[PDB]
Amino acid sequence: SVSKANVPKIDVSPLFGDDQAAKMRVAQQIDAASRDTGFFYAVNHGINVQRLSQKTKEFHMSITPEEKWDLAIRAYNKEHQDQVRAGYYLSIPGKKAVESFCYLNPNFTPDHPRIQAKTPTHEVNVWPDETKHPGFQDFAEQYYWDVFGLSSALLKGYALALGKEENFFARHFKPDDTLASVVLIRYPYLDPYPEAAIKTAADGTKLSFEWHEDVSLITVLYQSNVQNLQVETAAGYQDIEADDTGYLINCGSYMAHLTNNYYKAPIHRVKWVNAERQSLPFFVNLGYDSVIDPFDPREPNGKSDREPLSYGDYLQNGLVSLINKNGQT
Numbered sequence: 001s002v003s004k005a006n007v008p009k010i011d012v013s014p015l016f017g018d019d020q021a022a023k024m025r026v027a028q029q030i031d032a033a034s035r036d037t038g039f040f041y042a043v044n045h046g047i048n049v050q051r052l053s054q055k056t057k058e059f060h061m062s063i064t065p066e067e068k069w070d071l072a073i074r075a076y077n078k079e080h081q082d083q084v085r086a087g088y089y090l091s092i093p094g095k096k097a098v099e100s101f102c103y104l105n106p107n108f109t110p111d112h113p114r115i116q117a118k119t120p121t122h123e124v125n126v127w128p129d130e131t132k133h134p135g136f137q138d139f140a141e142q143y144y145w146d147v148f149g150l151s152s153a154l155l156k157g158y159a160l161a162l163g164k165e166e167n168f169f170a171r172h173f174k175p176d177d178t179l180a181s182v183v184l185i186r187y188p189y190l191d192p193y194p195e196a197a198i199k200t201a202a203d204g205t206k207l208s209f210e211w212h213e214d215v216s217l218i219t220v221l222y223q224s225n226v227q228n229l230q231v232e233t234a235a236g237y238q239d240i241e242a243d244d245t246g247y248l249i250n251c252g253s254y255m256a257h258l259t260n261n262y263y264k265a266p267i268h269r270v271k272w273v274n275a276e277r278q279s280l281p282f283f284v285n286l287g288y289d290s291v292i293d294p295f296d297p298r299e300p301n302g303k304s305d306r307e308p309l310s311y312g313d314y315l316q317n318g319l320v321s322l323i324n325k326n327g328q329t
């Protein structure tokens with residue numbers, strides 16, 4: 001009834017090493033995948049995803065309602081005016097099923113110059129009490145760095161794929177200032193599952209989250225082995241198979257901008273599934289003042305009629321618009 005999307009499995013291990021020819025062969029596969037459905041699985045990525053899953057499960061299943069208010073973002077807790085991005089996003093039983101915890105760069109500390117300046121989109125992370133969640137903060141911060149590593153390698157692949165030197169994106173993706181986020185999303189099993197938490201697409205498909213493009217350079221996603229994603233193709237919406245051993249990778253609308261839509265931000269959506277599962281994105285965001293000059297890999301002189309857009313500008317307005325379009329998560 002719905003056809004399977006072409007989502008290749010790409011061994012990205014050469015992107016960590018020094019074999020330039022092998023790196024170019026990976027880059028070709030990323031180009032291919034980016035020009036086709038816009039999705040691929042990164043395999044041989046080196047990340048312990050089963051441990052991520054386990055640690056995340058321990059957290060979601062032990063956090064209490066009291067803790068969630070204490071950690072809640074501003075949209076749920078008016079007292080937490082600084083928490084626009086980082087913290088807990090509550091469920092609303094009977095209305096909204098999904099809940100999550102988002103955290104930013106661990107280097108956004110109280111002394112960070114961007115935190116001092118109160119620059120939008122920079123926040124100091126909030127964490128649960130260590131005795132209630134032993135090891136969690138340390139685990140999560142280390143995870144950030146492990147997926148940051150993977151991400152840097154991927155960005156070397158995308159840069160090569162676009163005819164650039166391998167540090168073309170990665171030079172703007174830096175430990176000290178990246179706006180990248182981790183979200184630890186819980187999609188619950190509910191019996192009965194409230195109809196109010198289920199959206200219906202124009203084509204009749206039951207959804208948890210409507211069609212959209214990502215607010216990211218690239219999105220680096222772990223999920224449970226429960227099929228849920230669809231991508232819009234010329235042949236209609238197609239199902240993206242689950243693979244809980246790989247990371248699902250796609251471009252966001254910043255990459256679209258930079259490449260003049262050579263690498264499109266694929267339009268996708270999340271089907272409603274009544275299952276207890278995890279969706280753990282890392283949104284690969286650059287620095288607040290990062291600007292890459294837009295170019296066009298299909299044009300002889302490489303020139304584009306797109307204007308430079310700073311990442312911070314892109315991100316703050318992106319995140320607002322996505323809430324407007326698709327609802328407060």
Ligand SMILES: CO[C@@H](C)[C@@H](NC(=O)[C@H](CS)NC(=O)CCC[C@H](N)C(=O)O)C(=O)O
Pocket residue numbers: 085086102180181183185209213214215219221229270279281283319322329
């Ligand atoms: C596969 O979809 C994934 C990534 C997940 N969806 C999302 O995470 C959605 C749409 S990409 N993203 C968002 O809602 C943006 C969140 C940004 C975050 N609060 C930040 O401050 O950086 C899900 O709904 O399971």
Ligand SMILES: [Fe+3]
Pocket residue numbers: 212213214268
């Ligand atoms: Fe998305």
